[PDB]
Design a protein around this motif. Structure first.
Motif, mmCIF file in Angstrom:
data_model
loop_
_atom_site.group_PDB
_atom_site.id
_atom_site.type_symbol
_atom_site.label_atom_id
_atom_site.label_comp_id
_atom_site.label_asym_id
_atom_site.label_seq_id
_atom_site.Cartn_x
_atom_site.Cartn_y
_atom_site.Cartn_z
ATOM 1 N N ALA A 76 0.926 -1.077 -0.116
ATOM 2 C CA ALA A 76 0.089 0.000 0.025
ATOM 3 C C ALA A 76 0.655 1.379 0.026
ATOM 4 O O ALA A 76 0.563 2.158 -0.722
ATOM 5 N N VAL A 77 1.686 1.131 0.958
ATOM 6 C CA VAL A 77 2.804 2.352 1.038
ATOM 7 C C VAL A 77 2.147 3.511 1.569
ATOM 8 O O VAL A 77 1.068 4.426 1.231
ATOM 9 N N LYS A 78 2.448 4.061 2.730
ATOM 10 C CA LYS A 78 1.961 5.380 3.618
ATOM 11 C C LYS A 78 2.532 6.699 2.913
ATOM 12 O O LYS A 78 3.821 6.603 2.587
ATOM 13 N N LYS A 79 1.997 7.769 2.710
ATOM 14 C CA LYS A 79 2.388 8.868 1.901
ATOM 15 C C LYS A 79 2.088 9.811 3.057
ATOM 16 O O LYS A 79 1.319 9.903 3.665
ATOM 17 N N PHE A 80 2.788 11.022 2.740
ATOM 18 C CA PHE A 80 2.616 12.109 3.454
ATOM 19 C C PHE A 80 2.318 13.493 2.944
ATOM 20 O O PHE A 80 2.622 13.414 1.577
ATOM 21 N N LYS A 81 1.549 14.443 3.515
ATOM 22 C CA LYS A 81 1.570 15.678 3.077
ATOM 23 C C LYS A 81 2.687 16.384 2.944
ATOM 24 O O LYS A 81 3.635 16.177 3.864
ATOM 25 N N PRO A 82 3.043 17.640 2.173
ATOM 26 C CA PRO A 82 4.307 18.307 2.288
ATOM 27 C C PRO A 82 4.066 19.435 3.546
ATOM 28 O O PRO A 82 4.498 20.463 2.884
ATOM 29 N N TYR A 83 3.832 19.016 4.581
ATOM 30 C CA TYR A 83 4.084 19.962 5.782
ATOM 31 C C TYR A 83 5.409 20.339 5.961
ATOM 32 O O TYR A 83 5.662 21.260 6.730
ATOM 33 N N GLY A 113 13.154 9.657 0.917
ATOM 34 C CA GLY A 113 12.632 11.009 1.134
ATOM 35 C C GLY A 113 13.793 12.148 1.549
ATOM 36 O O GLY A 113 13.344 13.087 1.395
ATOM 37 N N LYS A 114 14.399 11.671 2.350
ATOM 38 C CA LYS A 114 15.410 12.757 2.887
ATOM 39 C C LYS A 114 17.044 11.996 3.115
ATOM 40 O O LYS A 114 17.132 10.889 3.311
ATOM 41 N N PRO A 158 9.563 20.304 3.469
ATOM 42 C CA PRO A 158 10.150 19.752 2.451
ATOM 43 C C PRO A 158 10.794 18.278 2.863
ATOM 44 O O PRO A 158 10.945 18.282 4.013
ATOM 45 N N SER A 159 10.769 17.500 1.817
ATOM 46 C CA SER A 159 11.363 16.105 2.145
ATOM 47 C C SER A 159 10.412 15.212 2.971
ATOM 48 O O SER A 159 10.367 14.158 3.143
ATOM 49 N N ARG A 160 9.291 15.845 3.288
ATOM 50 C CA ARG A 160 8.183 15.023 3.788
ATOM 51 C C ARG A 160 6.970 14.910 2.494
ATOM 52 O O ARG A 160 6.243 14.243 2.398
ATOM 53 N N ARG A 161 7.416 15.586 1.421
ATOM 54 C CA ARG A 161 6.612 15.682 0.099
ATOM 55 C C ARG A 161 6.641 14.363 -0.709
ATOM 56 O O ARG A 161 5.880 14.403 -1.668
ATOM 57 N N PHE A 162 8.049 14.052 -0.495
ATOM 58 C CA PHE A 162 8.438 12.844 -1.295
ATOM 59 C C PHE A 162 8.383 11.613 -0.384
ATOM 60 O O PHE A 162 8.235 10.227 -0.822
ATOM 61 N N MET A 163 8.741 11.662 0.944
ATOM 62 C CA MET A 163 9.003 10.787 1.813
ATOM 63 C C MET A 163 7.734 9.574 1.848
ATOM 64 O O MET A 163 6.668 10.145 1.582
#
Ligand SMILES: NC[C@@H]1O[C@H](O[C@H]2[C@@H](O)[C@H](O[C@@H]3[C@@H](O)[C@H](N)C[C@H](N)[C@H]3O[C@H]3O[C@H](CO)[C@@H](O)[C@H](O)[C@H]3N)O[C@@H]2CO)[C@H](N)[C@@H](O)[C@@H]1O
Ligand SMILES: [Mg+2]
Ligand SMILES: [Mg+2]
Ligand SMILES: [Mg+2]
Ligand SMILES: [Mg+2]
Ligand SMILES: [Mg+2]
Ligand SMILES: [Mg+2]
Ligand SMILES: [Mg+2]
Ligand SMILES: [Mg+2]
Ligand SMILES: [Mg+2]
Ligand SMILES: [Mg+2]
Ligand SMILES: [Mg+2]
Ligand SMILES: [Mg+2]
Ligand SMILES: [Mg+2]
Ligand SMILES: [Mg+2]
Ligand SMILES: [Mg+2]
Ligand SMILES: [Mg+2]
Ligand SMILES: [Mg+2]
Ligand SMILES: [Mg+2]
Ligand SMILES: [Mg+2]
Ligand SMILES: [Mg+2]
Ligand SMILES: [Mg+2]
Ligand SMILES: [Mg+2]
Ligand SMILES: [Mg+2]
Ligand SMILES: [Mg+2]
Ligand SMILES: [Mg+2]
Ligand SMILES: [Mg+2]
Ligand SMILES: [Mg+2]
Ligand SMILES: [Mg+2]
Ligand SMILES: [Mg+2]
Ligand SMILES: [Mg+2]
Ligand SMILES: [Mg+2]
Ligand SMILES: [Mg+2]
Ligand SMILES: [Mg+2]
Ligand SMILES: [Mg+2]
Ligand SMILES: [Mg+2]
Ligand SMILES: [Mg+2]
Ligand SMILES: [Mg+2]
Ligand SMILES: [Mg+2]
Ligand SMILES: [Mg+2]
Ligand SMILES: [Mg+2]
Ligand SMILES: [Mg+2]
Ligand SMILES: [Mg+2]
Ligand SMILES: [Mg+2]
Ligand SMILES: [Mg+2]
Ligand SMILES: [Mg+2]
Ligand SMILES: [Mg+2]
Ligand SMILES: [Mg+2]
Ligand SMILES: [Mg+2]
Ligand SMILES: [Mg+2]
Ligand SMILES: [Mg+2]
Ligand SMILES: [Mg+2]
Ligand SMILES: [Mg+2]
Ligand SMILES: [Mg+2]
Ligand SMILES: [Mg+2]
Ligand SMILES: [Mg+2]
Ligand SMILES: [Mg+2]
Ligand SMILES: [Mg+2]
Ligand SMILES: [Mg+2]
Ligand SMILES: [Mg+2]
Ligand SMILES: [Mg+2]
Ligand SMILES: [Mg+2]
Ligand SMILES: [Mg+2]
Ligand SMILES: [Mg+2]
Ligand SMILES: [Mg+2]
Ligand SMILES: [Mg+2]
Ligand SMILES: [Mg+2]
Ligand SMILES: [Mg+2]
Ligand SMILES: [Mg+2]
Ligand SMILES: [Mg+2]
Ligand SMILES: [Mg+2]
Ligand SMILES: [Mg+2]
Ligand SMILES: [Mg+2]
Ligand SMILES: [Mg+2]
Ligand SMILES: [Mg+2]
Ligand SMILES: [Mg+2]
Ligand SMILES: [Mg+2]
Ligand SMILES: [Mg+2]
Ligand SMILES: [Mg+2]
Ligand SMILES: [Mg+2]
Ligand SMILES: [Mg+2]
Ligand SMILES: [Mg+2]
Ligand SMILES: [Mg+2]
Ligand SMILES: [Mg+2]
Ligand SMILES: [Mg+2]
Ligand SMILES: [Mg+2]
Ligand SMILES: [Mg+2]
Ligand SMILES: [Mg+2]
Ligand SMILES: [Mg+2]
Ligand SMILES: [Mg+2]
Ligand SMILES: [Mg+2]
Ligand SMILES: [Mg+2]
Ligand SMILES: [Mg+2]
Ligand SMILES: [Mg+2]
Ligand SMILES: [Mg+2]
Ligand SMILES: [Mg+2]
Ligand SMILES: [Mg+2]
Ligand SMILES: [Mg+2]
Ligand SMILES: [Mg+2]
Ligand SMILES: [Mg+2]
Ligand SMILES: [Mg+2]
Ligand SMILES: [Mg+2]
Ligand SMILES: [Mg+2]
Ligand SMILES: [Mg+2]
Ligand SMILES: [Mg+2]
Ligand SMILES: [Mg+2]
Ligand SMILES: [Mg+2]
Ligand SMILES: [Mg+2]
Ligand SMILES: [Mg+2]
Ligand SMILES: [Mg+2]
Ligand SMILES: [Mg+2]
Ligand SMILES: [Mg+2]
Ligand SMILES: [Mg+2]
Ligand SMILES: [Mg+2]
Ligand SMILES: [Mg+2]
Ligand SMILES: [Mg+2]
Ligand SMILES: [Mg+2]
Ligand SMILES: [Mg+2]
Ligand SMILES: [Mg+2]
Ligand SMILES: [Mg+2]
Ligand SMILES: [Mg+2]
Ligand SMILES: [Mg+2]
Ligand SMILES: [Mg+2]
Ligand SMILES: [Mg+2]
Ligand SMILES: [Mg+2]
Ligand SMILES: [Mg+2]
Ligand SMILES: [Mg+2]
Ligand SMILES: [Mg+2]
Ligand SMILES: [Mg+2]
Ligand SMILES: [Mg+2]
Ligand SMILES: [Mg+2]
Lengths: 49, 272, 9
Positions: B1-8, B206-207, B10-15
């Motif tokens: 499935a993979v958990k995705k994050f919002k870009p709150y 992601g970072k 930078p580096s959380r936007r791709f992570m």
RNA sequence: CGAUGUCGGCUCGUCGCAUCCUGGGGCUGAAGAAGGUCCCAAGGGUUGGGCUGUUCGCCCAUUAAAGCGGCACGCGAGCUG
RNA sequence: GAAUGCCGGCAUGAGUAACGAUAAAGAGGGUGAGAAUCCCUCUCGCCGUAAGCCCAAGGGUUCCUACGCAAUGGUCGUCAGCGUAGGGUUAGGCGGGACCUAAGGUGAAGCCGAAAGGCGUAGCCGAAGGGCAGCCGGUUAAUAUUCCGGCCCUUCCCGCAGGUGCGAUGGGGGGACGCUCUAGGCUAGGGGGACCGGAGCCAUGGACGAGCCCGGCCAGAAGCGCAGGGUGGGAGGUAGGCAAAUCCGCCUCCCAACAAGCUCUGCGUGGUGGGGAAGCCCGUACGGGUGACAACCCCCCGAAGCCAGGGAGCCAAGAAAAGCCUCUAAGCACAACCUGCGGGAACCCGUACCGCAAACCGACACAGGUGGGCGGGUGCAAGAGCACUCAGGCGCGCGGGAGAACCCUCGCCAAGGAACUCUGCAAGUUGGCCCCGUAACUUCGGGAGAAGGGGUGCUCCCUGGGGUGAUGAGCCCCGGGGAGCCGCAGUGAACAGGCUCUGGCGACUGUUUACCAAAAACACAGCUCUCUGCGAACUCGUAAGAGGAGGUAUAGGGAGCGACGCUUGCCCGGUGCCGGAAGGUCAAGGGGAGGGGUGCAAGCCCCGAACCGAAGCCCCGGUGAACGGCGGCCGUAACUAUAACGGUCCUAAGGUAGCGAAAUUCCUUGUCGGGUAAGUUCCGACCUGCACGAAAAGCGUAACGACCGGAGCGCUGUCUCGGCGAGGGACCCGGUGAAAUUGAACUGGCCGUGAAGAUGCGGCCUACCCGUGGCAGGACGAAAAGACCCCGUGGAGCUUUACUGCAGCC
RNA sequence: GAGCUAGCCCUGGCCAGGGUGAAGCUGGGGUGAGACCCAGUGGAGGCCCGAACCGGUGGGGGAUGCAAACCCCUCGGAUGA
RNA sequence: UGGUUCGUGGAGCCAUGGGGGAAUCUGGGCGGACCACCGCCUAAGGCUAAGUACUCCGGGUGACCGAUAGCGCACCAGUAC
RNA sequence: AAAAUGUUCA
RNA sequence: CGCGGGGUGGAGCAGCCUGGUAGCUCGUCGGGCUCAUAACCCGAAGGUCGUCGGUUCAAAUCCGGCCCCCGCAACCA
RNA sequence: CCGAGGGUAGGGCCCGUGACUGGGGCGAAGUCGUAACAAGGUAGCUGUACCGGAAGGUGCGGCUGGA
């Protein structure tokens, strides 16, 4: 600033002690040289108990 | 499935983080069978011999079962599926009726409560281990031994498998994760099914930090260095190489085949 | 002293 | 070459005249005014900006005029860098 | 007599610079041969998340005291951290060891290595980690959780009394663990008190007042009480936990699912023990007496600390071993083990003192460096911030005068506001909180503290929520509404963003040249290429061995590019790599046609042609996100101009998209357009790209930046263009007293001359002898045997299709 | 010789106080079921301001210095590589 | 491959790592490739004084030093630092 | 297997 | 200034180093095919080889000096 | 108190203008090629994708407005 001498009794002993020198041929020769020289102190005097 | 994050940030936007829903209510592990002290250290007696290793989370080794032929015939109930810091795959905690508790590397499709077992007997089902022979040609399989009684060595990485292709006297032909064609001895155990956690490849670190968490120290380019350091070091403002691209130790790194020719292993291999 | 400064100015 | 710190800027100047202005004068294709050119003359004066590291130069607004050079391309045991 | 010679001695500069933070001193009285400097008293200033207390490291007599001042003290010195002498460091409970294990070290077995030696499971060693039994007071000049007083524990050993199959270095359990956020109840700590206790105090206009000032605890076994942590109890079956187990583990039936019950902590209370201010009186270098029969109570805030192995969430998935519980084996069950009570036994080392510093690291009484704990009160939204101040500790070991220049550090300024300048460098403006209010763009988060504003003190009235209390008084937190007061000014002092627009580069947080470069360099997620089937490749080591990895193609090594978006074209001729059981060449070796030397000879001994002979090279293909490369010359359209179009030569192929006077543009300040009064810069365009260009990536990109450029508003001492003032120096006096340098000196200017830049030579001119404060033109001033440059058949680092080797590989 | 310095290993410690407010929960809405949207809760982050702490940007002073890398003002990070 | 004066030289002898691999007196090595002849020796096991080297130590002597010399030290020096 | 073109207004 | 490469029919290029012989493509011209043009087919013309010198029996060719043209270099201060 | 208006700051809509740039319309006899209408000499057209001086070519699927 921080200088280069940061005394530590354990370090000085583990590093330059009679038993360290005795452990290897390199060191044993150091005792030999110092003895032949007539050095009063063969290894550094590390103190405390 | 993979958990995705919002870009709150930078580096959380791709992570992107693994889905742990297959991790059954059992996050901390099992004493007894495992863990051992695991001995972090990026190098041999003295010197570093693989660059850029170190840092990153402390770990406990889960001592898993890579030779399933001890408990021939003895079935076990799959009790749990847990996170294993020291491999890509997940691991199954199973309870043998014998009482003994082992961990098996956890195949795709394995459910808790399931029955599993190893031996010549053994219904061809996901989780079961068999010598390669009795397994039907064409079935996909994993944790395959290379030589009999030497332990599982092929296909243990997440979402990997090999497929049985045919047989040849004492050997059955395998198609390994790489795509190689291998003659592997009939008497080698291998457990049916694919590895699972197959979304492992889809994760985006992601970072920089994340890399470090996994103990991967910064890898620096030969171009970045100097002639003392690397064939690619110097010269002036950037440089295109000026020789065929090389490792720091002088060997060419685009194309130079490196498997030794006269390996006795050769007469058992049929592919790339 | 021991330098180690390079001849700048 | 067992060391003479090398551009420009700032600062402080001073000197030469083959004078930019002001003073005096000859000729003028000098009506007058304003110019042109040469001689005498350095006492004093010779602005502030935009650009550029710039010297120089090009521009903007003026001015009696916006002079040219020498002094280790004056001046770093004075400053800047 | 010279070697920037060597050792030593003494000069010069020189009574010059300096005397180490600008936290600050004044006086009275002592002591003394001798006091700015020592002791005492009073007054003043400074620190107070310390410049105050307590440890750790390190230091090793510096501690206390007596007698002392030659030196050490940047001055003095009656003082001392200095000299002489003496005194001082008390432990079953603190820490370390007769306990444990981590990295790592060592290391029997074993493996390896010319020797020395290298590795190496067991074991051992190895510690602020695990384990472990003392709290509070009182005494010395100097030690105290060590001595003493009270209260309370820990082990062994020997006894009695009673319980039980006891019992191993062996099995199992436990010990046992991450980060972030956190609930409940407590304690530390703190505030307040009309209540309790106290010597005293009415000053200067007023106050005998629920007045001022000071203080209202600490420790404490058992038993309670309150918080909370641990944990299911049975019975059967059993093939696993490397022998054996009743133990654990796995099944199956019962009862619990609750903390009911067992225990385990913490906190209160507790038999009892101890402490106990201000002030005043005394003599200290300080402590003592009294205040006391001291009182020793009630509220409030409240932890980051305790209950602890609490709870929740997350991914990066979070030591071991022993003590401890338990199970059994050999043995032995007149042993032994457990509970209780008694008596007895309880070693070794450390303990002084400094400890953000004059006692440690910096040659120094050095403005630097140095790990952990406590760190009070008030106010400012908070806080370990900031201002002052408890307790406590200091005025920094040279002073006294003066009131120049000039320097440092700081305050203010008319009018102008960047005209300063390489550049608004610097300095200023702005500044906290609460509330309105916010654009392009954007990856939808952001950009945002955008910008730009208003409010901010004090008095009185009314009033809404909680919290602790019982549903209330109080005490403590947030608010709302309305009148009014004063000042130039209400985060009235201190701490506290200048803003915006637009380009370049890099995505971003990060990293870097300790000691001149923090960046556009490195790194970075991500993309691609390539190697690697596991005794993996790769790396270190002669080897053994080890990393890789107790991993296994979603893995690991190497290379480049460097988020993301859109993309990444043509050339395989050369070079590299990859693929080719053909062919050419090819070394040892095989093979011997044949020839040679000696022998009377059998023989012995030399060469030696065919041919058979690997890799490598050649050769045939492949391959550019492999090394790399990606044209020239003429002609042509019905105004000229230009050239869609054509010819031709050459190449392995003749740069596409996108960009372009660029971090790339030489001619160049290219030419237009914009900003400006004016613009070699800046932005936007044209393209003639000296000499862009697609993973040494191309063009873009929100956000981000101690990066670089341009502009504007605000605001200023940057400037016009300076002025005044403050203090620390400079200066004068007392005290102490260097340095680099120095051929010798009785050391003027000009014009010349001279190795071509003269105080010293020639001519003239000028000039009485000697200092002090200043300025720097000069002594081709000082300091470093010029870093540039060249030379030496000098030296190193690096490079490659330079030579020749070696490792490695074939 | 790694008591300075670089990296890694083992084991401990430290990071005041403020902001901003992701997922996820709960309720409501919507739909055939959804997606999704509103609150409320929640407390995420190489997130923001800012001490300690780690730094060393710019300027000034210092240059036989207090100091063989210091001091003043200013500035970067400060739950993470 | 080392050793010998011997650097592949016509390269023996003496040692040896690798490969092949005898013989017991009519057996074997050598006299500088090799052969013949003539001669010298008897390998693959070991021990063996003396003559020789040295001077920590004791003694003697000196066309050796006389405190910057002579050992680093004439002196409590491999000390202080 | 292959084969391009035909000036303006009537 | 220095270096080294080049001027050949109308256009673009060979021809030189080993001297005697100037050729290729296109274009041009004449002729056809077509109704006509081009394309296509058969014929033909066209080069003081940049110049000045001489080396030789003989110079596009070899050697010197100028003339343009193209490219490379100009570094350390 | 409110308040015309003035001032300061920040947005929105519209108009005008701008070096240069993009395609378009139109303008008797300029250039290059032949796409389409006959089977237009490759049936055409088509949505999309890539490419090319230009019409256009080709890949994929579709249409009869072709056999
Ligand atoms: N106006 C028509 C549009 O524009 C273009 O058409 C324009 C040009 O292509 C076209 O050019 C034509 C040319 O095609 C044809 N072969 C030759 C003719 N002489 C030219 O003509 C053009 O130029 C001349 C000047 O010489 C003018 O006088 C005349 O008006 C003009 N049409 O002239 C048009 C301007 O009027 C497109 N080709 C056409 O398809 C499109 O629909
Ligand atoms: Mg364990
Ligand atoms: Mg090693
Ligand atoms: Mg070692
Ligand atoms: Mg890198
Ligand atoms: Mg570099
Ligand atoms: Mg190199
Ligand atoms: Mg370059
Ligand atoms: Mg290179
Ligand atoms: Mg010189
Ligand atoms: Mg000199
Ligand atoms: Mg004159
Ligand atoms: Mg005149
Ligand atoms: Mg300007
Ligand atoms: Mg400028
Ligand atoms: Mg000049
Ligand atoms: Mg002048
Ligand atoms: Mg000059
Ligand atoms: Mg000059
Ligand atoms: Mg200077
Ligand atoms: Mg000078
Ligand atoms: Mg500069
Ligand atoms: Mg002499
Ligand atoms: Mg000297
Ligand atoms: Mg001397
Ligand atoms: Mg003087
Ligand atoms: Mg003086
Ligand atoms: Mg002085
Ligand atoms: Mg002082
Ligand atoms: Mg006295
Ligand atoms: Mg104060
Ligand atoms: Mg002493
Ligand atoms: Mg003392
Ligand atoms: Mg003194
Ligand atoms: Mg001193
Ligand atoms: Mg005394
Ligand atoms: Mg003393
Ligand atoms: Mg203890
Ligand atoms: Mg003992
Ligand atoms: Mg041990
Ligand atoms: Mg170990
Ligand atoms: Mg070892
Ligand atoms: Mg021990
Ligand atoms: Mg401990
Ligand atoms: Mg028992
Ligand atoms: Mg155990
Ligand atoms: Mg009165
Ligand atoms: Mg109590
Ligand atoms: Mg058993
Ligand atoms: Mg008392
Ligand atoms: Mg917990
Ligand atoms: Mg043990
Ligand atoms: Mg046990
Ligand atoms: Mg003590
Ligand atoms: Mg003490
Ligand atoms: Mg004491
Ligand atoms: Mg401290
Ligand atoms: Mg002092
Ligand atoms: Mg100090
Ligand atoms: Mg500190
Ligand atoms: Mg506090
Ligand atoms: Mg505050
Ligand atoms: Mg403070
Ligand atoms: Mg002013
Ligand atoms: Mg004013
Ligand atoms: Mg203004
Ligand atoms: Mg200016
Ligand atoms: Mg100016
Ligand atoms: Mg600027
Ligand atoms: Mg500034
Ligand atoms: Mg900018
Ligand atoms: Mg920018
Ligand atoms: Mg960056
Ligand atoms: Mg940064
Ligand atoms: Mg640096
Ligand atoms: Mg710097
Ligand atoms: Mg920076
Ligand atoms: Mg290994
Ligand atoms: Mg491993
Ligand atoms: Mg890889
Ligand atoms: Mg790069
Ligand atoms: Mg880059
Ligand atoms: Mg880039
Ligand atoms: Mg090829
Ligand atoms: Mg190629
Ligand atoms: Mg090739
Ligand atoms: Mg090959
Ligand atoms: Mg071959
Ligand atoms: Mg490419
Ligand atoms: Mg251009
Ligand atoms: Mg360029
Ligand atoms: Mg312009
Ligand atoms: Mg203009
Ligand atoms: Mg480039
Ligand atoms: Mg490239
Ligand atoms: Mg001033
Ligand atoms: Mg003053
Ligand atoms: Mg004096
Ligand atoms: Mg004189
Ligand atoms: Mg002269
Ligand atoms: Mg004389
Ligand atoms: Mg003279
Ligand atoms: Mg002077
Ligand atoms: Mg000099
Ligand atoms: Mg020299
Ligand atoms: Mg030479
Ligand atoms: Mg030499
Ligand atoms: Mg929510
Ligand atoms: Mg937060
Ligand atoms: Mg942060
Ligand atoms: Mg911050
Ligand atoms: Mg640093
Ligand atoms: Mg030899
Ligand atoms: Mg022989
Ligand atoms: Mg012989
Ligand atoms: Mg002979
Ligand atoms: Mg012999
Ligand atoms: Mg003598
Ligand atoms: Mg003497
Ligand atoms: Mg001597
Ligand atoms: Mg001596
Ligand atoms: Mg035509
Ligand atoms: Mg027509
Ligand atoms: Mg007509
Ligand atoms: Mg140079
Ligand atoms: Mg417009
Ligand atoms: Mg057609
Ligand atoms: Mg057609
Ligand atoms: Mg067609
Ligand atoms: Mg189509
Ligand atoms: Mg095509």
């Amino acid at each position: 600033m921080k200088r280069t001498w940061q005394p530590n009794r354990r370090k000085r002993a583990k590093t330059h002690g009679f038993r360290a020198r005795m452990r290897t041929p390199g060191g044993r020769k150091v005792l030999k040289r110092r003895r032949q020289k007539g050095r009063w102190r063969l290894t550094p005097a590390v103190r405390k108990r | 499935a993979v958990k995705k994050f919002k870009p709150y940030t930078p580096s959380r936007r791709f992570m992107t983080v693994a889905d742990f829903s297959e991790i059954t209510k059992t996050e901390p592990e099992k004493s007894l069978v495992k863990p051992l002290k695991k001995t972090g250290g990026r190098n041999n007696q003295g010197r570093i011999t693989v660059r850029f290793r170190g840092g990153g989370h402390k770990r406990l080794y889960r001592i898993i079962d890579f030779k399933r032929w001890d408990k021939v015939g003895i079935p076990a109930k799959v009790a749990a599926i847990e996170y294993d810091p020291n491999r890509s795959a997940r691991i199954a905690l199973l309870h043998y009726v014998d009482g003994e508790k082992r961990y098996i590397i956890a195949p795709d499709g394995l459910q808790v409560g399931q029955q599993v077992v190893a031996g010549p007997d053994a219904p061809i089902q996901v989780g079961n281990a068999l010598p390669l022979r009795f397994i039907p040609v064409g079935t996909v399989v994993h944790a395959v031994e290379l030589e009999p009684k030497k332990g599982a060595k092929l296909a243990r990485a997440a979402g990997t498998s090999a497929q049985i292709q045919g047989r040849e006297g004492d050997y059955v032909i395998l198609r390994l994760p790489s795509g190689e064609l291998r003659k592997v001895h009939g008497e080698c155990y291998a457990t049916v099914g694919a590895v699972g956690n197959a979304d492992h490849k889809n994760i985006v670190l992601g970072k920089a930090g994340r890399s470090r968490w996994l103990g991967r120290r910064p890898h620096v380019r030969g171009a970045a260095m100097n002639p003392v350091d690397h064939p690619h070091g110097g010269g002036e403002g950037r440089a295109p190489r000026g020789r065929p691209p090389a490792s720091p130790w002088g060997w060419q790194t685009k194309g130079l085949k490196t498997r030794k020719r006269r390996k006795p292993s050769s007469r058992f291999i049929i592919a790339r | 002293x021991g330098g180690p400064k390079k001849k700048k100015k």
